[PDB]
């Protein structure tokens, strides 16, 4: 139905940031969400165009890149089969804006092989300053 | 990579007429790998419609839209109070991917 | 218990033939992107 | 509730995180009953 | 050829400084790696401490530091240094070289081997008693 | 400290009470009283220089073998005792040389 993320976390230059974007509120739950459905964290700054931040595949929690965001940002699940996360290592006055996680089947379902970001989650904000 | 741009950046319309989302391409779009969000402030931006011509699960028969090659077009049947917010386009294939810029659409 | 010694499971290949391997490869997938492209073979990203 | 340390101390080779020694009670076929067993789990079998 | 001499006070007195020097003769002391024997009366064997290339003192842990291992090149002499010692420890020294041999049981490139310090040329030893009288 | 009783002729084995776990290299010693320690085998079947060929140690093929060491032809000076130095890879560094045992030879 809906993706859940929360955080309203302010940071310092030089510092990292946490923020985990999970399906069906209750911790104890088997919603089998991240399991065959891609997910996308995509950044928005205010005054500007959204860009795309990193994709995550559902078999292993193998991540993709972009070669912007490459050697400062790591993005994994737990043991359990929910809650992905999110590791921006390497803080800058530039990324200053809010933040999503859409659910994306990415062309690996049976019907239809579709292209299609359902629902999206929330939308936490980070700020910066000194 | 392909850059997305949209040309009608600011439009004004008035509740009960059919208005024009248009967007251009930068070289050979599949015409099959393109997405329409429907964004506002401090909201839930949700999904309007598939790929080039095909609906979701909470979109109802006035949403609409075709185009193939490098121009892609929405067309709206009717405007409403709770449509007046902005819209993103993107597109997918090779990594990274990009979206198309922005477009709003206001009441006047 | 371990009777004998504690010591590590390890998977040998031959270097020549998979050397070998990878050049074949690397000639195969050049018909793709031309002929200056530098072809890098990197380790995974991470993940489980 | 495993009580487990570490098997076959002091070891210089590089297997020195794994195979760790750990006693537990079971239950046994009279439920009245338990019995103390020990035994060797890796390092990704076990969490403190 | 390697040869030892030993040299020894004879006579100490408890809880002070201890120094029990062995000689070189024959050969420079680049490789061999020279070690401590204690024999006592009453027991068998123990072993003190050794030196390596690396000027690294590593002593027996059963010992709670009471030895100093230190060697020369300019005198070619070594200096074997106690301190705070007991009137129970009346034994005979012995000073011996050592040449290491590594033995691998699996592969060379993850550590699968360990190191042993042969004792092949020995030294003739002074006794060396301690005693309150 | 063990004592054994061997007589004139024929060979005897020694073990040493360190019970071998893993890959073995001992270094068996003889020790005079008074006089100074010598090496009669290394590295399990090596033989330094100026020893008698008459120590044979034991390989370390087929693991689970006993280390012990074979004296052929006991001559009547064999009273001095023997120390079974231990180097293995579970244990890790040995300090200690074990327990001394006495071959006193009657006749
Ligand atoms: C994947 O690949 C990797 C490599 O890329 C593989 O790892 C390899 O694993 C094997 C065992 O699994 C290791 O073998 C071990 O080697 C040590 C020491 O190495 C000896 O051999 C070297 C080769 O030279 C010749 O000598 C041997 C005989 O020793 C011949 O059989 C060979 O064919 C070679 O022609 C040699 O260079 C070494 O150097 C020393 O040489 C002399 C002799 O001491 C000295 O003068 C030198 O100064 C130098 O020190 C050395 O000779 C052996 O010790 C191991 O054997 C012992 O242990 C066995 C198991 O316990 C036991 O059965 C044996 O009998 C033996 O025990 C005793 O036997 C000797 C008989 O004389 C005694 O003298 C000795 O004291 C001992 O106590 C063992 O054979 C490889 O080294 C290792 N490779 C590397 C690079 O490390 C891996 O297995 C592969 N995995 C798979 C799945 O395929
Ligand atoms: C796989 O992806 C590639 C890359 O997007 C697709 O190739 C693209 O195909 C379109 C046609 O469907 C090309 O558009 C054409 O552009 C020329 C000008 O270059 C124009 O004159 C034509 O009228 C047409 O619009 C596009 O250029 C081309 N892109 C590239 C980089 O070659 C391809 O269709 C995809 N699918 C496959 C191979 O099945
Ligand atoms: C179930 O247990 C595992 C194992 O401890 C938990 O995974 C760890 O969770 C903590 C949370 O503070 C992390 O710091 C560790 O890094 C996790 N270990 C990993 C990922 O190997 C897991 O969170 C537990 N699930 C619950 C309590 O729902
Ligand atoms: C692997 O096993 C095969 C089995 O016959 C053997 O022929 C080969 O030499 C072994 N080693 C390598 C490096 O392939
Ligand atoms: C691999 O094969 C190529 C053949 O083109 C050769 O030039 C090269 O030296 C070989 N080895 C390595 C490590 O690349
Ligand atoms: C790359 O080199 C090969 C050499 O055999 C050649 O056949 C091929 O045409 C080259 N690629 C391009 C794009 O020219
Ligand atoms: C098994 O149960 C007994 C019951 O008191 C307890 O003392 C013991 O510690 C238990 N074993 C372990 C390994 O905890």
């Known amino acids: 139905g809906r993706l859940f993320q929360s955080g309203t976390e302010v940071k310092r230059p030089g510092a990292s940031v946490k923020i985990s974007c999970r399906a069906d509120d209750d911790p104890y739950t088997d919603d089998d969400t991240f399991t065959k459905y891609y997910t996308h964290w995509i950044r928005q700054a205010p005054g500007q165009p959204p860009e795309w931040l990193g994709v995550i595949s559902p078999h292993f929690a193998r991540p993709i890149y972009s070669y912007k965001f490459r050697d400062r940002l790591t993005l994994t699940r737990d043991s359990s089969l929910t809650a992905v996360y999110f590791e921006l290592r390497g803080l800058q006055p530039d990324d200053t804006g809010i933040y999503f996680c859409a659910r994306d089947p990415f062309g690996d379902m049976y019907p239809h092989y579709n292209y299609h970001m359902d629902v999206w989650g929330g939308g936490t904000t980070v700020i910066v300053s000194s | 990579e392909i850059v997305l741009t949209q040309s009608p950046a600011i439009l004004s319309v008035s509740p009960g007429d059919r208005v024009i989302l248009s967007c251009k391409a930068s070289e050979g779009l599949s015409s099959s790998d393109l997405a329409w969000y429907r964004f506002k402030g401090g909201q839930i931006p949700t999904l309007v419609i598939f790929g080039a011509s095909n609906r979701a699960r909470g979109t109802p028969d006035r949403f609409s839209g075709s185009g193939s090659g490098t121009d892609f077009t929405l067309t709206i049947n009717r405007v409403e109070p709770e449509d007046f917010a902005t819209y993103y386009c993107q597109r997918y294939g090779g990594t990274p991917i990009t979206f198309g810029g922005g477009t709003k659409v206001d009441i006047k | 218990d371990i009777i004998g010694d504690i010591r590590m499971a390890h998977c040998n290949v031959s270097k020549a033939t998979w050397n070998e391997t990878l050049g074949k490869v690397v000639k195969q997938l050049r018909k793709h992107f031309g002929n200056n492209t530098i072809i890098r073979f990197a380790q995974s990203s991470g993940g489980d | 509730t495993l009580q487990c340390t570490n098997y076959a101390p002091n070891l210089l080779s590089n297997m020195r995180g794994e195979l760790k020694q750990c006693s537990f009670n079971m239950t046994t076929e009279l439920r009245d009953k338990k019995q103390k067993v020990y035994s060797l789990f890796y390092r990704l079998d076990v969490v403190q | 050829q390697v040869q030892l001499q030993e040299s020894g006070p004879g006579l100490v007195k408890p809880s002070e400084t201890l120094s029990v020097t062995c000689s070189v003769s024959?050969?420079?002391?680049?490789?061999?790696?020279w070690t401590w024997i204690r024999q006592s009366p009453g027991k068998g064997l123990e072993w003190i401490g050794y030196?390596?290339?690396?000027?690294?003192?590593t002593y027996n842990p059963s010992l709670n530091s009471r030895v100093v291992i230190s060697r020369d090149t300019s005198k070619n002499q070594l200096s074997l240094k106690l301190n705070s010692v007991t009137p129970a420890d009346t034994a005979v020294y012995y000073c011996?070289?050592?040449?290491?041999?590594?033995?691998?049981?699996?592969?060379?490139?993850?550590?699968?081997?360990?190191?042993?310090?042969?004792?092949?040329?020995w030294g003739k030893g002074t006794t060396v008693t301690v005693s309150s009288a | 400290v063990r004592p054994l009783s061997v007589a004139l002729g024929e060979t005897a084995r020694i073990s040493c009470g360190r019970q071998a776990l893993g890959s073995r290299a001992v270094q068996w010693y003889q020790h005079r009283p008074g006089q100074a320690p010598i090496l009669l085998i290394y590295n399990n079947q090596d033989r330094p220089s100026g020893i008698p060929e008459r120590f044979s140690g034991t390989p370390d093929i087929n693991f689970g073998t006993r280390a012990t060491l074979t004296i052929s032809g006991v001559e009547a000076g064999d009273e001095a005792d023997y120390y079974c130095h231990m180097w293995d890879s579970r244990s890790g560094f040995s300090w200690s040389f074990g327990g001394a045992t006495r071959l006193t030879v009657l006749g």
């Open positions: 030196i390596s290339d690396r000027e690294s003192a």
């Open positions: 011996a070289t050592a040449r290491r041999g590594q033995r691998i049981y699996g592969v060379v490139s993850f550590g699968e081997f360990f190191y042993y310090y042969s004792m092949d040329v």
């Open positions: 024959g050969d420079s002391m680049n490789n061999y790696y």
